Design a protein around this motif. Structure first.
Motif, short mmCIF file in Angstrom:
data_model
loop_
_atom_site.label_atom_id
_atom_site.label_comp_id
_atom_site.label_asym_id
_atom_site.label_seq_id
_atom_site.Cartn_x
_atom_site.Cartn_y
_atom_site.Cartn_z
N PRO A 350 7.82 -5.60 -6.21
CA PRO A 350 7.23 -5.89 -4.90
C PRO A 350 7.87 -4.97 -3.84
N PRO A 351 7.07 -4.42 -2.94
CA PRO A 351 7.61 -3.56 -1.84
C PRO A 351 8.28 -4.38 -0.75
N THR A 352 9.10 -3.73 0.08
CA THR A 352 9.72 -4.39 1.18
C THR A 352 8.80 -4.78 2.32
N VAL A 353 7.81 -3.91 2.62
CA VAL A 353 6.81 -4.15 3.61
C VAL A 353 5.53 -4.56 2.86
N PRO A 354 4.97 -5.75 3.22
CA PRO A 354 3.75 -6.16 2.49
C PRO A 354 2.67 -5.07 2.58
N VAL A 355 1.93 -4.86 1.51
CA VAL A 355 0.85 -3.90 1.51
C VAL A 355 -0.07 -4.02 2.71
N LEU A 356 -0.51 -5.22 3.06
CA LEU A 356 -1.44 -5.35 4.19
C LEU A 356 -0.75 -4.82 5.46
N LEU A 357 0.50 -5.19 5.69
CA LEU A 357 1.22 -4.69 6.92
C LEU A 357 1.37 -3.20 6.89
N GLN A 358 1.58 -2.58 5.72
CA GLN A 358 1.63 -1.11 5.66
C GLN A 358 0.30 -0.55 6.13
N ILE A 359 -0.81 -1.12 5.69
CA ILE A 359 -2.17 -0.61 6.07
C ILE A 359 -2.40 -0.86 7.55
N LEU A 360 -2.04 -2.00 8.10
CA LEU A 360 -2.28 -2.25 9.55
C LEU A 360 -1.43 -1.33 10.39
N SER A 361 -0.28 -0.89 9.86
CA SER A 361 0.62 0.09 10.60
C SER A 361 0.19 1.50 10.48
N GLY A 362 -0.84 1.82 9.72
CA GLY A 362 -1.56 3.10 9.74
C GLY A 362 -1.57 3.87 8.46
N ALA A 363 -1.02 3.31 7.37
CA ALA A 363 -0.95 4.02 6.09
C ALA A 363 -2.38 4.01 5.62
N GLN A 364 -2.99 5.15 5.44
CA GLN A 364 -4.40 5.04 5.10
C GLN A 364 -4.87 5.78 3.87
N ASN A 365 -3.98 6.08 2.95
CA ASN A 365 -4.51 6.22 1.61
C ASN A 365 -3.52 5.62 0.64
N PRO A 472 -10.14 1.95 5.03
CA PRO A 472 -10.49 2.26 6.44
C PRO A 472 -10.97 1.11 7.24
N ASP A 473 -11.58 0.09 6.62
CA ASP A 473 -12.08 -1.03 7.36
C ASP A 473 -11.16 -2.28 7.33
N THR A 474 -9.94 -2.19 6.71
CA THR A 474 -9.13 -3.35 6.49
C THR A 474 -8.71 -3.96 7.82
N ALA A 475 -8.27 -3.09 8.74
CA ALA A 475 -7.73 -3.64 10.01
C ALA A 475 -8.86 -4.31 10.87
N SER A 476 -10.01 -3.67 11.00
CA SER A 476 -11.11 -4.25 11.78
C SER A 476 -11.64 -5.52 11.08
N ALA A 477 -11.66 -5.57 9.75
CA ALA A 477 -12.23 -6.74 9.04
C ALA A 477 -11.28 -7.95 9.06
N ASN A 478 -9.98 -7.75 9.16
CA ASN A 478 -8.97 -8.77 9.03
C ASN A 478 -8.04 -8.87 10.24
N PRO A 479 -8.61 -9.27 11.40
CA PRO A 479 -7.68 -9.55 12.55
C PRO A 479 -6.61 -10.58 12.18
N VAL A 480 -5.37 -10.38 12.61
CA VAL A 480 -4.27 -11.18 12.18
C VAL A 480 -3.73 -12.04 13.34
N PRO A 481 -3.38 -13.30 13.10
CA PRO A 481 -2.79 -14.18 14.12
C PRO A 481 -1.38 -13.81 14.38
N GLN A 482 -0.90 -14.13 15.60
CA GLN A 482 0.47 -13.90 15.91
C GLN A 482 1.49 -14.47 14.93
N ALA A 483 1.20 -15.70 14.45
CA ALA A 483 2.13 -16.31 13.47
C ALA A 483 2.31 -15.47 12.21
N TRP A 484 1.24 -14.78 11.83
CA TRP A 484 1.34 -13.88 10.67
C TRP A 484 2.19 -12.64 10.98
#
Ligand SMILES: *[C@@H]1O[C@H](CO)[C@@H](O[C@@H]2O[C@H](CO)[C@@H](O)[C@H](O)[C@H]2NC(C)=O)[C@H](O)[C@H]1NC(C)=O
Ligand SMILES: *[C@@H]1O[C@H](CO)[C@@H](O[C@@H]2O[C@H](CO)[C@@H](O)[C@H](O)[C@H]2NC(C)=O)[C@H](O)[C@H]1NC(C)=O
Ligand SMILES: [Cu+2]
Ligand SMILES: [Cu+2]
Ligand SMILES: [Cu+2]
Ligand SMILES: [Cu+2]
Ligand code: NA
Length: 499
Positions: A350-365, A472-484
């Motif tokens: 398992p990575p240190t930064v969750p995959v979804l958070l890596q993608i929301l932070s701009g990793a795009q391939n 490319p569409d992960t961030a627009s499709a999955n808005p995240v709550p502050q608690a997340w």
């Protein structure tokens, strides 16, 4: 009672003795299995998970996956640690707030941190359909008709060697069963039925590893649902159910009033039924309170075979009717050596930064994503085919894909593909040496979706990859709550991790 769709859920440590041997556990709602979470198709679930864990021997962090729910637009609520979130730390809580459009069936929930679900955090999750097309086939469908099958270990999960052939100490049916060694006559579960009524039995494998040969003496079973997907009626006298799978079957209480053994024989651990291991009791109203005296047959003449199953709806199969006939046809190289599994040459860690958070932070391939080599990008709005050829040690491996179900174009033990009317499901045995179990789905759900063997010991030993679907569409499709957004800072602060 069932809880939900809006509920709190406390995760605690306690001692339990489901086979007469006391050990500490990780529990949802204070019980093993946890309480049933339920609602109706299309409902908003808000499960506020309170992490009250204090015993480090079973991990004091947690994360919960809602198995088989697609999580479209809510990838952040899916639960796999380090794929869609950082774990919840002790003394904190987290609202998993999602919707279940277009799904109705039998599901379950479990810890998705390490091997923690083995230590007890597992329960049923049912999405009822008020207009169920199968409603006229039965009279009773409620919490009393859910049947869970579980492996139970006397050794705590975090003391199980990585990559070992780990074996259980009891089979539990509805939370009760007898131990394979040092067997004591501890209480067996009783399922009660009324002569003449028809029951929708919801059979749920909450296993961490074994598959079970499930049967009920004197009775057959008419399958009407597979992993959430309505099926044509298929009558069988035995169901081989792999870890994490589910079936609904109609049980007709059409035998003489009496007591009948319910049998669940695992593929490893105790074999047979001596001393009432691997057993529960079907009791008719009016029967004597005593153990059954029934016998299994020597062989089962109408066992479930997966290619016999077909969807109730005309679901078809996406793509073209031949191997490789998809927009994105994949073949995974699935291997095991020296205590570690790998997929395409890479063992999952398992990575240190969750995959979804890596993608929301701009990793795009997928080559920018960690773990390197463990993330495969999928294109949007495309037919995907994944062949999963078996042979890796420790089989048969039940592979599970998050965010989706899939057509089973080719099943275990049968070389012939089906491009017309195979069942769709979410967890599939990949069979044995020389098999080529193959699945298909279409990519209409942006986000990182885990693909792994659902023998939890194998996942821990690396038998996984992530499908980064429509980066490319992960961030627009999955808005995240502050608690997340707060989870990774809190977790990393508590564990002294820098990022
Ligand atoms: C399982 O089926 C896949 C296709 O779905 C086969 O993949 C082919 O493998 C050969 C080499 O083995 C390649 O030449 C092709 O490019 C692959 N894709 C094809 C033909 O569409 C795979 O070989 C099969 N594995 C087993 C064990 O039967
Ligand atoms: C092996 O799998 C194939 C494909 O799912 C099964 O073949 C189907 O058999 C049904 C039932 O007789 C026929 O209606 C279909 O036309 C067949 N489809 C194809 C593509 O051949 C086959 O029955 C399975 N083998 C066993 C022993 O169950
Ligand atoms: Cu699961
Ligand atoms: Cu899942
Ligand atoms: Cu496995
Ligand atoms: Cu998973
Ligand atoms: Na088709």
């Amino acid at each position: 009672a069932q809880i939900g769709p809006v509920t709190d859920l406390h995760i605690t440590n306690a001692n339990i003795s489901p086979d007469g041997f006391s050990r500490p556990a990780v529990l949802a709602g204070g019980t093993f299995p946890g309480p049933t979470i339920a609602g109706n198709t299309g409902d908003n679930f808000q499960i506020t998970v309170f992490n009250d864990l204090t015993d480090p021997s079973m991990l004091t962090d947690t994360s919960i996956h809602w198995h088989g729910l697609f999580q479209k637009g809510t990838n952040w609520a899916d639960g796999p640690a380090f794929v869609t979130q950082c774990p919840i730390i002790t003394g904190q809580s987290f609202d998993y707030n999602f919707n279940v459009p277009g799904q109705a069936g039998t599901f379950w929930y479990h810890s998705h941190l390490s091997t923690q679900y083995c230590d007890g955090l597992r329960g049923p999750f049912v999405v009822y359909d008020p207009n169920d097309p199968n409603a006229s086939l039965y009279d009773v469908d409620d919490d009393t008709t859910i049947i869970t099958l579980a492996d139970w270990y006397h050794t705590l999960a975090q003391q199980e060697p990585i990559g070992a052939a780990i074996t259980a100490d009891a089979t539990l049916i509805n939370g009760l069963g007898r131990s394979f060694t040092n067997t004591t006559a501890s209480p067996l579960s009783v399922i009660t039925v009324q002569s003449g009524k028809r029951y929708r039995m919801r059979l749920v494998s909450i296993s961490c590893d074994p598959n079970y040969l499930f049967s009920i003496d004197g009775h057959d079973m008419t399958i009407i649902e597979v992993d959430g997907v309505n099926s044509q009626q298929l009558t069988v006298d035995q169901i081989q159910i792999f870890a994490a799978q589910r079936y609904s079957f109609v049980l007709n209480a059409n035998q003489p009033v009496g007591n009948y053994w319910i049998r669940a024989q695992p593929n490893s651990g105790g074999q047979g039924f001596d001393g009432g291991i691997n057993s529960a009791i079907l009791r008719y109203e009016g029967a004597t309170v005593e153990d059954p005296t029934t016998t299994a047959p020597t062989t089962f003449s109408n066992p479930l075979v997966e290619t016999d199953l077909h969807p109730l709806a005309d679901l078809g199969v996406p793509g073209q009717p031949f191997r490789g006939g998809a927009d994105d046809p994949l073949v995974l190289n699935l291997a095991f050596a020296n205590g570690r599994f790998s997929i395409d040459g890479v063992s999952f860690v398992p990575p240190t930064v969750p995959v979804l958070l890596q993608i929301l932070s701009g990793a795009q391939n997928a080559q920018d994503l960690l773990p390197a080599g463990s993330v495969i990008s999928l294109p949007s709005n495309s037919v995907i085919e994944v062949a999963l050829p078996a042979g890796a040690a420790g089989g048969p491996h039940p592979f599970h894909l998050h965010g989706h179900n899939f057509a089973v174009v080719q099943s275990a033990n049968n070389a012939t593909p089906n491009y017309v009317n195979p069942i769709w499901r979410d967890t599939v045995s990949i069979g044995g040496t020389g098999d080529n179990v193959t699945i298909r789905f279409t990519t209409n759900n942006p986000g990182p979706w885990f693909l792994h063997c659902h023998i939890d010991w194998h996942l821990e030993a690396g038998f996984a990859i992530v499908f980064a679907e429509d980066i490319p569409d992960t961030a627009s499709a999955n808005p995240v709550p502050q608690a997340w957004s707060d989870l990774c800072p809190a977790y990393d602060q508590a564990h002294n991790i820098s990022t």
